[PDB]
Amino acid sequence: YTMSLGAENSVAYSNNSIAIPTNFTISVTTEILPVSMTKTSVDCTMYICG
Amino acid sequence: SALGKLQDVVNQNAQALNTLVKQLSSNFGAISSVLNDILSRLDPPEAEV
Amino acid sequence: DSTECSNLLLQYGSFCTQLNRALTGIAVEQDKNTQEVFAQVKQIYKTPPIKDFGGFNFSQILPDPSKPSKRSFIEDLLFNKVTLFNGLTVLPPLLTDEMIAQYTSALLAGTITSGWTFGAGAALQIPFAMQMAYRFNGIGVTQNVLYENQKLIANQFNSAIGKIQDSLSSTA
Amino acid sequence: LTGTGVLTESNKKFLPFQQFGRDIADTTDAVRILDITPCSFGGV
Amino acid sequence: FCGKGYHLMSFPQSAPHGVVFLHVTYVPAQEKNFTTAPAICHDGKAHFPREGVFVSNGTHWFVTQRNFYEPQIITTDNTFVSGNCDVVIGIVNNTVYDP
Ligand SMILES: *[C@@H]1O[C@H](CO)[C@@H](O)[C@H](O)[C@H]1NC(C)=O
Ligand SMILES: *[C@@H]1O[C@H](CO)[C@@H](O)[C@H](O)[C@H]1NC(C)=O
Ligand SMILES: *[C@@H]1O[C@H](CO)[C@@H](O)[C@H](O)[C@H]1NC(C)=O
Ligand SMILES: *[C@@H]1O[C@H](CO)[C@@H](O)[C@H](O)[C@H]1NC(C)=O
Ligand SMILES: *[C@@H]1O[C@H](CO)[C@@H](O)[C@H](O)[C@H]1NC(C)=O
């Protein structure tokens, strides 16, 4: 199929109309960030010759 | 798959290391990929080539 | 298409797989870059049919229904201002220019209809004059400054947009 | 087959037709049966 | 930068080769429409909110805070006056309580 970018909704804009929230939500999300990689060392002489 | 980024980093490192190890067993145009075999089968000149 | 060369390459190792893997990773991360940059919002907001934004004129940046890929005037100017075998293939991007234009239009509509409220949750409509008053208060200038200089500020914004149009059109 | 290492008794099971035994990297690991282990080495 | 929504706080956690941030954010919900006015004409002077917006439910005008519907009677304490209201585009008539 052709991927959809998301639900298409038109905001009820008017020059004298505002929308205020009456409630809230405490949302806890997780962000995962790599910080290091395995520290590898190679003995060049042994690897090439052995 | 919630830790996809970390798992991907680990996979890249491991795959690169494994590719190196596998490349350690290629002829590159030599008679054999085993240095001991070349040394035991050939005399100095062609051994070194 | 050389069997002898292919046989010679076989016994040379696995460099071909490494190179192909690197190029594939590059392409995947390019698609990821485009997605991360342009796909901030997952709702395609639409600008209203009546455009009464307190005197501000965004027609130069909003999509034109003429369907030139449904890109704004400045977007068309930018696209027209950039001048673009042996196993070498060019892969198409995951997101087409039309979809990227849709994303940018959604971002524009959200910004001009609801301000920053659409990035913290559900878009909240607000008159554009009041949104600009919010922003003026944000930079440390009271609201009355805007509400008393609304016409002047709208004219200055329109003139600036026109100047950007001219600079992108003529100046190289 | 020339090599250098330590020969040890092996718990692996070689079928009667098998002579050498290779682990990953295609380096000989056992020979008819004795396991081969590289002599202790490392960095300093 | 620290999660979608208005960032409140975050907690770090370790991982094998990285970190995991638990971002606690505030996300508004349960929207409701209102009619707004940039300012208020009272005694021939324009009043603007000190901090908040002027809203009306159907008939009455309150001054609430932007991110949470907490309406309050318009007063000289929560509004500031700036000149007459012949220049503001879209000002509305109402009474400003004097406490
Ligand atoms: C806000 O939502 C909670 C549940 O998420 C509900 O218990 C509470 O009554 C709501 N408050 C209002 C004012 O709607
Ligand atoms: C109230 O706002 C919603 C969107 O926030 C809109 O769909 C609806 O039309 C508005 N109310 C009226 C009476 O138009
Ligand atoms: C608006 O609010 C005021 C005070 O809270 C109330 O007296 C009035 O009935 C409300 N009107 C509507 C239409 O809700
Ligand atoms: C809003 O627009 C309507 C026409 O759609 C107009 O009658 C009204 O005066 C305008 N109000 C403001 C505050 O711009
Ligand atoms: C507000 O009141 C003044 C006089 O008190 C009047 O001239 C003006 O027309 C009123 N505003 C509106 C929108 O009716």
Question: How far, CA to CA in Å, does E45 sit from each of C54, D40, E89?
Answer: 22, 92, 14
- Count of CB atoms situated within 10 Å of the CB of B14: 11
Q: Is C103 helix (H, G, I), strand (E, B) or coil?
A: helix
Report the helix count and the strand count for chain A, using DSSP H and E: 1, 2
Distance CA C94, CA C34 (A): 9
C146 half-sphere exposure, CB direction, 13 A CA radius: 25
DSSP string, C51-70: --STT---TTTSPPTT-SSS
Distance CA E28, CA A15 (A): 22
Contact D7, D39 (CB under 8 A): no
Report the nearest-CA residue for atom 4 of ligand 5. E44
DSSP string, chain B: -TTHHHHHHHHHHHHHHHHHHHHTT--TTSS-S-HHHHHHHS-HHHHH-
Could you tell me which residues are beta bridge partners of residue E10? E23
C21: part of which helix (H) or strand (E)?
A: helix C15-38
CA C168 remoteness from chain centre: 16
Q: Does C touch D (3+ CB pairs < 8 Å)?
A: no
Distance CA E7, CA E25 (A): 4
Token reading at B18: 């494994």
> Cα of E68 to ligand 1 centre, how many Å?
13
Q: Is E40 helix (H, G, I), strand (E, B) or coil?
A: strand
* Mutation site, A29, A31, A32, interface B, largest B CB count within 10 A: A32
Query: Exposure of C150 by Cβ count < 10 A (0-12 exposed, 13-18 middle, 19+ buried)?
Result: buried
Residue with tokens 């990953």: D24
Q: Which atom of ligand 3 is nearest to the CA of E71?
A: 5
Contact E55, E94 (CB under 8 A): no
Identity at E4, one-letter amino acid code = K
Question: How far, CA to CA in Å, does C9 sit from each of A42, B17, B34, C4?
Answer: 26, 22, 19, 9
In the 8-state DSSP scheme, what is residue E68? B
Chain E CB within 8 Å of residue A36 CB = yes
Q: Which residues of B touch A30 (CB under 8 A)?
A: 2
Could you tell me which residues are beta bridge partners of residue E11? E22
- Count of CB atoms situated within 10 Å of the CB of E98: 9
In the 8-state DSSP scheme, what is residue E97? B
Q: What is the resolution of this structure in A?
A: 2.9
* Closest by CA position to C147, among listed D1, E92, E6, D44: E92
Tell me which residues have their CB closer than 6 angstroms to ligand 1.
Answer: A 22-23; E 30
Identity at B32, one-letter amino acid code = S
Could you tell me which residues are beta bridge partners of residue E26? A26, E6
Distance CA D44, CA D26 (A): 28
Q: How was this structure determined?
A: cryo-EM
Identity at E95, one-letter amino acid code = T
Q: Which residues of B touch A37 (CB under 8 A)?
A: 9, 13
